[PDB]
Design a protein around this motif. Sequence first.
Motif, short mmCIF file in Angstrom:
data_model
loop_
_atom_site.label_atom_id
_atom_site.label_comp_id
_atom_site.label_asym_id
_atom_site.label_seq_id
_atom_site.Cartn_x
_atom_site.Cartn_y
_atom_site.Cartn_z
N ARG A 1 -21.61 89.24 19.79
CA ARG A 1 -20.25 88.74 19.76
C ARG A 1 -19.82 88.39 21.10
O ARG A 1 -19.09 87.24 21.02
CB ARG A 1 -19.28 89.91 19.11
CG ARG A 1 -19.35 90.09 17.76
CD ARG A 1 -19.02 91.40 17.21
NE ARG A 1 -19.15 91.47 15.76
CZ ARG A 1 -20.32 91.59 15.21
NH1 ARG A 1 -21.57 91.70 15.80
NH2 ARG A 1 -20.55 91.63 13.97
N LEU A 2 -20.29 88.64 22.10
CA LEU A 2 -20.00 88.19 23.71
C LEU A 2 -20.70 86.79 23.81
O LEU A 2 -20.05 86.29 24.66
CB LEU A 2 -20.33 89.36 24.73
CG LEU A 2 -19.62 90.47 24.69
CD1 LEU A 2 -20.36 91.50 25.63
CD2 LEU A 2 -18.06 90.12 25.00
N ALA A 3 -21.86 86.58 23.25
CA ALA A 3 -22.39 85.39 23.83
C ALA A 3 -21.69 83.96 23.65
O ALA A 3 -21.80 83.31 24.81
CB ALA A 3 -24.00 85.18 23.07
N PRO A 4 -21.17 83.79 22.66
CA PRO A 4 -20.18 82.37 22.71
C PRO A 4 -19.10 82.41 23.65
O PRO A 4 -18.32 81.54 23.71
CB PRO A 4 -19.64 82.04 21.40
CG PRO A 4 -19.76 83.45 20.92
CD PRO A 4 -20.60 84.42 21.29
N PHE A 5 -18.62 83.59 24.18
CA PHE A 5 -17.73 83.76 24.99
C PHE A 5 -18.40 83.21 26.60
O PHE A 5 -17.41 82.66 27.54
CB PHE A 5 -16.85 84.96 25.50
CG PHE A 5 -16.07 85.35 24.38
CD1 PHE A 5 -16.82 85.93 23.35
CD2 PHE A 5 -14.70 85.00 24.40
CE1 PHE A 5 -15.95 86.46 22.06
CE2 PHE A 5 -13.97 85.50 23.33
CZ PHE A 5 -14.60 86.17 22.36
N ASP A 6 -19.56 82.45 26.46
CA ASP A 6 -20.03 82.07 27.57
C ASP A 6 -20.27 83.08 28.93
O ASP A 6 -20.24 82.67 30.08
CB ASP A 6 -19.59 80.78 28.11
CG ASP A 6 -19.92 79.66 27.29
OD1 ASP A 6 -20.93 80.08 26.62
OD2 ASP A 6 -19.63 78.34 27.35
N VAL A 7 -20.66 84.21 28.34
CA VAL A 7 -20.63 85.36 29.65
C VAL A 7 -22.11 85.30 30.00
O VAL A 7 -23.14 84.77 29.21
CB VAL A 7 -19.99 86.63 29.28
CG1 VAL A 7 -18.37 86.66 29.23
CG2 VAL A 7 -20.64 87.32 27.83
N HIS A 8 -22.41 85.74 31.25
CA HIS A 8 -23.72 86.18 31.29
C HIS A 8 -24.00 87.72 30.93
O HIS A 8 -23.35 88.56 31.34
CB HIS A 8 -24.13 86.21 32.80
CG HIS A 8 -23.90 84.46 33.47
ND1 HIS A 8 -22.78 84.51 34.29
CD2 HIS A 8 -24.52 83.55 33.37
CE1 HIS A 8 -22.71 83.17 34.59
NE2 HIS A 8 -23.95 82.65 34.05
N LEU A 9 -24.97 87.77 30.13
CA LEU A 9 -25.30 89.02 29.44
C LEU A 9 -26.47 89.66 30.00
O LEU A 9 -27.49 89.37 30.24
CB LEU A 9 -25.62 88.82 27.92
CG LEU A 9 -24.26 88.27 27.07
CD1 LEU A 9 -24.96 87.86 25.83
CD2 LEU A 9 -23.33 89.13 26.90
#
Lengths: 374, 374
Positions: B209-217
């Motif tokens: 769910r965080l991925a398309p926020f463009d965060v570095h995971l």
Amino acid sequence: AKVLCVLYDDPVDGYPKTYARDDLPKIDHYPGGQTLPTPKAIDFTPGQLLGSVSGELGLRKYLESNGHTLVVTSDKDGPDSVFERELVDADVVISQPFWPAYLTPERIAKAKNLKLALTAGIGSDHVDLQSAIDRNVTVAEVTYCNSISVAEHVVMMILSLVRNYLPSHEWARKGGWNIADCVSHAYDLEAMHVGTVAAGRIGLAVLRRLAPFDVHLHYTDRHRLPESVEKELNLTWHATREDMYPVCDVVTLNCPLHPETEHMINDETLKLFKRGAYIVNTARGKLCDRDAVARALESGRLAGYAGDVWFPQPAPKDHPWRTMPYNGMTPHISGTTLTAQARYAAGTREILECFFEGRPIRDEYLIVQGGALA
Amino acid sequence: AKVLCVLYDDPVDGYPKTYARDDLPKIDHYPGGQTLPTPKAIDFTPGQLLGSVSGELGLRKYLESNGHTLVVTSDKDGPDSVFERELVDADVVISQPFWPAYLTPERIAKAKNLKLALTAGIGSDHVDLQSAIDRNVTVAEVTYCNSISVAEHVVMMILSLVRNYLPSHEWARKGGWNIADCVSHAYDLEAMHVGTVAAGRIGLAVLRRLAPFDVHLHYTDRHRLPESVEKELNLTWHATREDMYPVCDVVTLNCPLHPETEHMINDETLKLFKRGAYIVNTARGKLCDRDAVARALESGRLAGYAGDVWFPQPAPKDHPWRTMPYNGMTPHISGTTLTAQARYAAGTREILECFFEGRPIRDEYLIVQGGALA
């Protein structure tokens, strides 16, 4: 040149001396590949408060070292304001949509030196475009500077309404526990139908962020997105807003306010909504009939309403949306995170450098070319 | 058989007669392909309040029509409670992690008929496993029933801390406007480093769910995810929690509480965090030193803390986390949305049908096989 910059007041306990963090994430481009602002330099540390009076968009040293005048004020309303007094001989006017200095036909006529009307932010709702055009006044915006910021606010809001976060947090804050009172209005977002009105820079960013929540995504717009986009996001297209509402659990408004979209959400259109629908609106307050939404939440037609936009704005102390049930409102702030500010302060400067140095101003920035290059 | 079911109290203004919506989204499987619960039937309408006393997990008609006894109570604490009085001859005990009826060595020894300890929910932290094993007591959970619910709460919380939503909402609620006061602690999430401690059903759902926020995971876990997963999400692996903290803007805890993970977030480990870090914790309250987190927020080491888990639980009226600055807490509720309840009510029934009919209970449900089939 004389620059007249309107910004919102500093925080009530003063302009900050310290900040929560030491820097901001590095980003080079916006989705689609538009580059982040490119001024020759910046005179702030990204993450500083730039959109309030003491921040001055970080413009002062640049403009003054170049022989210009910068007047900054928050005093913008009616004929006696600092804004309207200083306007008469300003070459450049700058304000943010969060504290807009309205350039009406009247004010423009009074603006005898006006050559550029810069939105530190996105858009031009506060500028009379015909009047700008009739005076060869360049109208520029920092396109894309906070499309992502708004999209994040939207998704935050959707989740928070659906999951009943704000009342749940109040129970915690107030010494309660009260699991059933928290969760008797709380659902998962997963596999709901969510629809956006418009899939522009904001609405698409919203759709992309909603996708791995496993929701069914719907949209409507003037035109369809590319087929490849509709396919990667499994989007269902609706020709009209009215076609879309009935199937949606959540509807988010990411469209322009027009003569034709005003009060598009009103007592009759709200009947098209599924019972317990949620609405998020970070677009314009008047897209919605103010009391019609308040009614739908008292009724249960809507199970949630949130946004940062209001009519009018600033919202008066007693605006019903502040206190209506299941609201998740904020003041008008989504595109003015410190992050967004750093971008639009930089683009504001980029535009002024081009403007003053007689270089072209990015085509994506221009709303009305005046006597600027493009 | 006698079934002893502990549930949390109804809402303070009564068990609801109406609900915000008429139905729940249709879902057939969980990510990875585990099927949603499959009881032979259910006697509730999904979306009803099932986890409170009056809801009874929708079990009564099923158990009684089959010749069983169902006792439901919220009274679960200490030796005089309805729970402990009824326990002595109960064949089956059921509770939720949101209002757990603890099966200690003592209580188990007293439970002379006990054959099954069912978690309506995920896990078994409230059950003494060795003791269950020493009595051939089957311990079952409704695996996956609310992994997604929690992951959504996590992402909601992260966004809300980073964007300063809760104070912003209070300004709105209280008649304010105050843009600078809202946004002098407000950032975009985009392109931050976010890390999860553990990438199980919850933490992976969070990462996706965080991925398309463009965060570095980032993540750490006992073991790495498949390479294909790490690749699709561009994940950075860290061998240890301590290795991960320093590079993260946001850290979310999605790991088990163990002897070794207790107070893993304390005054010394908090120094490993980047200044202005945010922590979200929907895992266990005691993963964190309670006053160490309160200190880090007064200090600004942390710019936000949120979760729904606390020590102890229910949180006493005066727990500091209720009121510490930049907290985004809820009572312990993430996995008990009405949506989750419908799933775990159905799986609770599924398990009891298998148990009573002498059919095997899903392997994914079993924590301790007793005299059940698998």
